[PDB]
Design a protein around this nucleic acid. Structure first.
Lengths: 140, 121, 86, 166, 184, 49, 118
RNA sequence: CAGAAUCAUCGAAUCUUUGAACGCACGCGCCUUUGGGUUCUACCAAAGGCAUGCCUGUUUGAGUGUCAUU
RNA sequence: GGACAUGGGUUAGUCGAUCCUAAGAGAUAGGGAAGCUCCGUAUGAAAGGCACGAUUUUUCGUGCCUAUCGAGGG
RNA sequence: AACCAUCUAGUAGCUGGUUC
RNA sequence: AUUGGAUAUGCCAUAUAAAGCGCUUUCGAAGAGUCGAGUUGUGCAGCUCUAAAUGGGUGGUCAUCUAA
RNA sequence: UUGACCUCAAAUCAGGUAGGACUACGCGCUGAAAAUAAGCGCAGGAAAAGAAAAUAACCAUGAUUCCCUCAGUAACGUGAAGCGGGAAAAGCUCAAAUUUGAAAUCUGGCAACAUUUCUUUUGUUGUCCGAGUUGUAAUUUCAA
């Protein structure tokens, strides 16, 4: 009706036909590979979550439930596996630190972490006692 | 009908002269139409009138590719060569600029990002 | 066309005086001589003086306008200003 | 930090110091143009707290308006039209006399790489922020048009919600 | 002689200041340190100039190459500048001598400084022009400088200067700082 | 235009205005130059400077 | 009785929101669609005998429950810096709301950053 | 009627006079370079340029504005 | 037939316009106006070029003068 | 003052019509 | 043919660092011709005047919030 | 005699940006015989609002928006709001505290090196000039 839409009604240029509509636009799953294998491309998301043993929501369902009649283990072992592979949170000492703590321990014994902190010459960086122990245990 | 793949491997002045030739017959072909001509010649006007277009397209493609290479890796290049998407697209924040975060916001998502978890049942 | 004015072509157009050549190039005298020394530039006496001087009479040195316009695009002139900056 | 002293000194607007400066400055501005750019904020603390940083991209303009809507609101729209390539951040009162009130107007350049790369003023580069002053989005705009949380502050009335299964 | 609108603005403004009854807090910024003590103050200051961004790099590369191949110092002594930094120093009583630029444009910035430095007992002076104080620190302009601590070698020179600023700036004037300036 | 009256500054305040302690920043060598130094060494090792 | 709002888009708004739920969780599978909300008492005399979902767990609820503010928003436990526990009843009802949550939670490990040296 | 297509697709171009309309007006100029002529200090042609307000920077400055220099 | 059909026809260094101003219109400098806009054009505008010189510290010194459209004019 | 499109299907206590 | 986000693996990595939480014999900055009072135009606005720091706002001495 | 600055200019200076259109929905402002129409300004795929100077008087609630309910109630024919049920959910950033054992920050020029919806896009590295101490980074935002 509008001149604009009358233009391409009386024009000869073909439209920009864009083919988009899909009945039941159930979006397919990406993200986790485990769930993506064991998804049901037909059933609904709240069915699929309850099928797998995953709580769809922790909070109460604000409507009805589905009553038709009168993976979680895999996710668990995969989880503890990766925590095991990436577990060694311990860090070594760089060459500077290797000398830095050695010179402090070669002169203030080994357990007087309050004395090393008070030192003004060797403990130039003014590291507190809590970090001095951290560098100590990091050496071993 | 000069094939374009034949033309585009020619030289510049070689294409310049063929264009100079291509004006002459088309100038002569129209002259015969006002003075009276045959069907074959009248149809040949259209083919020559596209053959001028094919050559001229080839010259410009060559001329602009020269500028594109000559201006390759420079901060400022001619406006006719830059992106022409939309005035608003050109003035909007670049993804690098939209991606920018304060150092505080880089510590927040470093030590406390979004986790991947799961509620059992 | 209009009645063409005096001194709009010929010897009143190509021949341009030293003072005009200064303000056309935007230079001081000492820099103008320097770029005249470095390049090949020299006054050229016009055949008809008062014709070439808009009817004036006073003795003035002349240059070719073609010559001065070459000095406009000389890249070294910029290095004179960069030293004025320096 | 001096910005503590300056703010508590801008409270006393009729003391011996402020009175002299007001009459001295209000004379200066009235000789200058009605909307003239400032080389620096005349209140380096008030501009500071409203979002001005001394860095390239931030622009201060000074404007006088006759006394007798809101003057601060006109100060935005008149300068926002004067520098039409610049966004209007905030604005503040600097001086007044028996005829005029003077304001300074903080503007930023959306086109400046020092602005387009700093992630605390990136927001104003966005298109939605074109002519905020013309739409009541500055502080004087939001205050004036009643935007405020509380009990102190159309189509929902005169429509019919004619549902399907009524 | 038709003056430009801005030449007229500059000169009328200068005349206006000398005519009006300037408040005492702004009146003190017109009677300043003399010239002989001014060059003596800056003779010391130009020993403690902070290193330029050119020197601060050439130095730090030397440490970097020392670390890069194979490898601690003394506190850097220089002059303290910046309004917020200096105002904090006086309050923290870490400043030995404060030099206040006489012609800061919005005079709000330094108008409280002589009172505050008097309050904390920090010997201060109002040195002529900011651009002099700017060049000491390698800047266009400095609203205020402050000497906080000098090496033992120059500790005697600073003490000598401080007694001069006392005798030439604060011993003199003092009472004149409490009179409304201008009105001439 | 009465003469300036100093009803507060006529006395000298002995204590510093702030009570907070001195953070160890002002006694240890600069950390900020350390970031600069270690970045400077890295460019030297990686051949940038 | 001027301009009317007619609800012919009610059935299509029902599906538009269903698809948005479908689109969302498909992007974040293992994790639930919604966060856990606390259980709070309505603020009236007509409604103080009922329990309803809150906005998030206060600072003290998470502190006793064993999560800090920063790690509580990552694993999906909203915080409520406004709300506060005026009585030990609300503290215990919501502390043990997070207790069952943290028991049913499988926080997957992330990628670590391991510099070549210390 | 006398690698096609009165084809599709569309990431490369072309896009006359205008119009916010922008050298000045509703025809007249200036600027830089290049070319032509069996005519070359004249003439002509061609290509590329010249709107205002503002912002960052640059260079050239003005000031009986501020001050310094034995 | 002034109808339609089908073609052809207006040639300029010297004839007019293009060149100018008049009454006025009128952009700018400014100033109003919540605002479309308004006033203002000599207005408290830094509003246009000329000459000189062995080249002057191889960084410019010295001296002089003070819009625009609009048809009878050519 | 005239004209134009809107407000506007302005206003009715009244005139005329109102279908096998 | 472009791409979204994860996963595996390789190569670099400034970690002389940065961050969360226990604890405190230490401290805790918080937006003015704006709040507000008088009047005027239809909560906001104009004019006249002009603030404070357990202060200030809003509710029913307590509660609640912490504007510019 | 030479120089710092401060303010102000000029340039067909280097690089940029604004205008006009569409206007169903957005945000203003102005306004009739309804806060309507008309007028005026301004945006985006949504806009606006928005992390309490908020309610309440409880066993308390907890940004905003929207739907139902509250309710034709309250207050004064106009015509609420809290609570209640739902949809959706996400939080945060500055100014004000000395980095002072180091302006740690950034625009630009050139030089390189990559990258690309892309020879059209986007950056990193070095280097020089400047911006900036009248305050650019790190840190902090009252929940602390």
């Amino acid at each position: 009706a509008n001149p604009r839409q009358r233009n391409k009604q009386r024009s000869g240029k073909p439209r920009l036909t864009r083919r988009n509509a899909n009945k039941k636009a159930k979006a397919k799953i990406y993200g986790n590979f485990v769930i993506q294998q064991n998804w049901d491309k037909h059933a609904t998301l709240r069915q699929n979550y309850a099928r797998l043993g995953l709580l769809a929501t922790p909070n109460y369902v604000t409507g009805g439930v589905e009553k038709l009649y009168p993976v979680v283990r895999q996710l668990e072992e995969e989880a503890v596996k990766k925590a095991a592979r990436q577990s060694n949170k311990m860090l070594p000492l760089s060459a500077f630190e290797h000398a830095y703590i050695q010179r402090l321990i070669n002169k203030y014994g080994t357990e007087d972490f309050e004395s090393m902190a008070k030192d003004v010459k060797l403990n130039s960086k003014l590291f507190n006692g809590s970090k001095l122990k951290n560098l100590y245990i990091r050496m071993k | 009908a000069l094939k374009t793949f034949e033309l585009r491997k020619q030289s510049q002045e070689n294409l310049a002269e063929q264009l100079q030739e291509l004006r002459q017959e088309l100038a002569s072909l129209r002259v015969q139409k006002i003075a009276g001509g045959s069907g074959s010649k009248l149809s040949k006007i259209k083919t020559t009138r596209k053959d001028i277009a094919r050559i001229l397209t080839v010259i410009n493609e060559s001329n602009r590719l020269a500028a594109r290479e000559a201006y390759k890796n420079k901060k400022y290049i001619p406006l006719d060569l830059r992106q022409k998407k939309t005035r608003a697209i050109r003035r909007a924040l670049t993804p690098y600029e939209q991606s920018r975060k304060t150092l505080k916001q880089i510590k927040k998502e470093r030590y406390f990002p979004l986790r991947k978890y799961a509620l059992k049942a | 066309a209009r009645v063409k004015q005096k001194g709009k072509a010929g010897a009143a157009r190509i021949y341009i005086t030293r003072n005009q050549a200064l303000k056309k190039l935007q230079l001081t005298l000492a820099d103008f001589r320097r770029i005249c020394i470095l390049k090949g530039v020299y006054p050229r006496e016009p055949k008809n003086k008062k014709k070439a001087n808009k009817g004036s009479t006073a003795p003035v040195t002349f240059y070719y306008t073609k010559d001065i316009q070459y000095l406009l695009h000389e890249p070294i002139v910029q290095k004179f200003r960069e030293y004025k900056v320096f | 930090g001096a910005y503590k002293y300056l703010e508590e000194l801008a409270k006393k607007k009729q003391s011996d110091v402020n009175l002299f400066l007001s009459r001295v400055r209000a004379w200066e501005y009235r000789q200058m143009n009605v909307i003239h750019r400032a080389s620096r904020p005349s209140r380096p603390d008030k501009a500071r707290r409203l979002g001005y940083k001394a860095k390239q991209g931030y622009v201060i303009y000074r404007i006088r308006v006759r006394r007798g809507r809101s003057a601060r609101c006109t100060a935005e729209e008149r300068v926002g039209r004067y520098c039409s390539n610049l966004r209007v951040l905030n604005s503040y009162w600097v001086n007044q006399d028996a005829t005029y009130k003077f304001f300074e107007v903080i503007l930023v350049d959306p086109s400046h790489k020092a602005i387009r790369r700093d992630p605390r003023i990136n927001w104003i580069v966005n298109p939605v922020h074109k002519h905020r002053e013309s739409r009541g989005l500055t502080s004087i705009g939001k205050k004036s048009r009643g935007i405020g949380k509380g009990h102190r502050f159309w189509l929902r009335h005169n429509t019919l919600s004619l549902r399907r299964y009524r | 002689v038709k003056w430009p609108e801005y030449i007229r603005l500059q000169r009328r403004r200068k005349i206006l200041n000398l005519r009006l009854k300037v408040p005492p807090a702004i009146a003190q910024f017109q009677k300043t340190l003399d010239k002989n003590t001014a060059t003596q103050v800056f003779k010391l200051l130009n020993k403690y100039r902070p290193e330029t961004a050119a020197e601060k790099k050439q130095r730090l590369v030397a440490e970097a190459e020392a670390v890069a191949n194979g490898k601690v110092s003394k506190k850097p002594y220089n002059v303290k500048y910046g309004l917020n930094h200096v105002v904090a120093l006086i309050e923290a009583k870490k400043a030995k001598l404060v030099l206040i630029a006489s012609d800061v444009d919005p005079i709000e910035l330094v108008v409280f400084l002589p009172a505050l430095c008097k309050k904390m007992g920090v010997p201060y002076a109002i040195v002529k022009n900011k651009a002099r104080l700017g060049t000491v620190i390698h800047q266009k302009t400095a609203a205020v400088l402050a000497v906080t601590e000098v090496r033992e070698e120059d500790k005697n020179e600073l003490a000598s200067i401080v007694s001069a600023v006392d005798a030439n700036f604060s011993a003199k004037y003092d009472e004149s700082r409490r009179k409304w300036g201008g009105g001439i | 235009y009465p003469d300036y009256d100093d009803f507060f500054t006529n006395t000298v305040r002995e204590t510093p205005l702030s009570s907070a302690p001195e953070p160890k920043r002002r006694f240890a060598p600069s950390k900020h130059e350390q970031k600069r130094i270690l970045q400077l060494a890295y460019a030297i090792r990686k051949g940038r400077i | 009785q001027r301009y009317v709002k007619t609800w012919f888009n009610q059935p299509g708004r029902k599906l538009r929101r269903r698809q948005a739920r479908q689109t969302k969780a498909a992007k974040i599978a293992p994790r639930p669609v919604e966060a856990i909300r606390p259980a709070v008492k309505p603020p009236t005399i007509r409604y103080n005998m009922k329990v309803r979902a809150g906005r998030g767990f206060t600072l003290e609820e998470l502190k006793a429950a064993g999560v800090s503010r920063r790690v509580a928003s990552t694993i999906g436990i909203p915080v409520d810096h406004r709300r506060r526990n005026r009585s030990e009843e609300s503290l215990q009802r919501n502390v043990e709301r997070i207790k069952v949550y943290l028991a049913h939670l499988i926080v997957f490990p992330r990628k670590a950053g391991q510099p070549k040296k210390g």
